[PDB]
Design a protein around this nucleic acid. Sequence first.
RNA 1: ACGUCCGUCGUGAAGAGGGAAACAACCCAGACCGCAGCUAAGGUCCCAAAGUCAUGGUUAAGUGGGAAACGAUGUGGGAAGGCCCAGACAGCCAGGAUGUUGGCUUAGAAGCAGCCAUCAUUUAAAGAAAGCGUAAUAGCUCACUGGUCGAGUCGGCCUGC
RNA 2: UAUCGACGGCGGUGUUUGGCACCUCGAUGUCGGCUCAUCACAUCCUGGGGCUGAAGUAGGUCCCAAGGGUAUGGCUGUUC
RNA 3: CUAAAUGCGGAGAGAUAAGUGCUGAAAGCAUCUAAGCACGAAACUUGCCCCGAGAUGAGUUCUCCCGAAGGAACGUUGAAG
Lengths: 131, 167, 122
Amino acid sequence: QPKRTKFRKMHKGRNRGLAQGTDVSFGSFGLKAVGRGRLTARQIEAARRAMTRAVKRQGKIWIRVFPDKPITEKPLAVRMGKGKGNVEYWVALIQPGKVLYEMDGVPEELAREAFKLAAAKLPIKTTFVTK
Amino acid sequence: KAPVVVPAGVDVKINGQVITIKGKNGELTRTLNDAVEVKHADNTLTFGPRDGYADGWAQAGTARALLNSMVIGVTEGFTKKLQLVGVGYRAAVKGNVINLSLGFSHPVDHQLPAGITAECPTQTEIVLKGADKQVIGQVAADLRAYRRPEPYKGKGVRYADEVVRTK
Amino acid sequence: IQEQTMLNVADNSGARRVMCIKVLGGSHRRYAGVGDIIKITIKEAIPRGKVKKGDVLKAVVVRTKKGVRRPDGSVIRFDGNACVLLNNNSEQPIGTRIFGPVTRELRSEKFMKIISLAPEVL
RNA sequence: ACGUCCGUCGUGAAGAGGGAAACAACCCAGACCGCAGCUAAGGUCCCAAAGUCAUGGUUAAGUGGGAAACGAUGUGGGAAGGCCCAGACAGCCAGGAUGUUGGCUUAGAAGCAGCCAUCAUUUAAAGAAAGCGUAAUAGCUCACUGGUCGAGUCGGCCUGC
RNA sequence: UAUCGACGGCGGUGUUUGGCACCUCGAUGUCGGCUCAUCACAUCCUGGGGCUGAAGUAGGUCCCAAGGGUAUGGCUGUUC
RNA sequence: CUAAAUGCGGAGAGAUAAGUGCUGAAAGCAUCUAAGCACGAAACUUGCCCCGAGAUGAGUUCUCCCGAAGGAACGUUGAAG
């Protein structure tokens, strides 16, 4: 699927947004996912809102990858109208070795349980990384 | 190898794959044929294969148990004490078939397996003693089985049931 | 006896004739024998006093044209057909007196009150 | 819509022979005649013609072939944290308390709906309490400690079927 | 989290519909019904079970099961 | 001959599923199992009735041609067609 964006027509809005956590200090942690895959904005919200709703203990939870690749669909016959932007909103491109969610935290992992809850929402076997 | 000492009042003899235990209560002959050689020492019955595979130990655990079971069943034996109860119509439990259960017309019965005594005195307690274990434990379980309300009528309301006091 | 049939009344509720509707507990190609309770809608009667002509009630067949055989081997046959109207009160005639004979099996085992008012028994 | 129109490949085209059970394209390999020998396809225990052939290993399923998002102390292998024989980590026995039914809220909630705190007491231990349970209590476990048990145990990452 | 169950995500069936024209228009005349012969199962009651907003009772939903039985009219040519 | 007629049309036994238990390991505890074992469905097999040697295990029996120990054909009629 040739990477896409817009410069076309305006579609729906972002189901995501709340970056959460404080960004006064930049860290280098994360949660890598072995395997490339396209994740829609919605599923990203469910996973993000899953951990954020569990890491009430603190914060410093952040995400680097965001959906920037639109995908249109077409319901009915066919013969006039390339594609409209429906349920299929922006989608993020994840690399075989890309870090998605990283939380600035020293060995006190209380979010591993949160990342686990989210790891069951995105279609891809993710693994927990300390580095 | 798991040596199993034998009581002073127990005498066991083995000839091939057959193991016979003698004592006071009676005698019990059992056969244990597998990838193991069971021999009897002047003071202990030995059991120890050559390999240590899982299936080799699994059979070792049951063997030692069966043997230990044949020892107690000859020195003490097997006996279960059961008692009948009924709020309303007394259930007449006879050596043949029980009657007047919950007030039902026809009686409920169950064939007596093997050859064990189930003498039941005219009271609230009964006894089912025998030589075999898988028998004295079945006849006692079935006795309660039929006492279990067949219809879709939950318990609590129907106390009538002859449960076993001691195992 | 089938549906849409015309039979006479045996009680005195003010009704003369009756138009059989259907039977209770019987799904067959038209049928309604003696002893079978059936809901009907009288035709000829007294249109006053209490809305009679038009209302739908229940009744019990007593006599029919069809001949029924008895244990001995003899068959009995009647002229037309008749029935007795009953109210909500579990099997209870609305009228006071009943006209016409009745069967035997329709007594002891089943109804014990209908026999007490039966002026004839075959 | 049993396409229009491009790209790769492959066949129908101009293909033997041959295996793949059968087969347009998968693998190998290319036709004179008769004949001899040796190889390829594939097959080589028997029908069937050819070794029931050599070394090593796996599975045990007869799997020998549809099979998936998802689950699994079935089992085998490897790396890494902590606790280990100056009686612990797990079993078994007995505790697990006192102000307090903490405050608030709530018809009621008295460790355990929810809302905020979460100190102090006796002290070997006992969190105003991690779960089950009650309408609310009660009751039953855990955390923690002692005795006994005396040994491999526990959390965790990856890989094969 | 005990019926109901949104947003979102992941699937199965292909009974529905829209429907990419290699198969038949050198043409397997059209729907439904009717009548007649032959070969099967993702079912309502009853029976045996799972969950329970299952205390009991009465119900809701789901699995299983053909063993028996599905026998009828008025308007419209009409099929649902 | 028929009919809105009449007489007749099992029980039981055996093996399993769901499920209920026994004994007993892998984890010296525990556990319905993993080996073994006792029970457990109108369903399965049989029993019962009907058809049936073109049922390729395509049958059997006795007697009839092995120089005669019968049979096909024929005649008169059907509890047959």
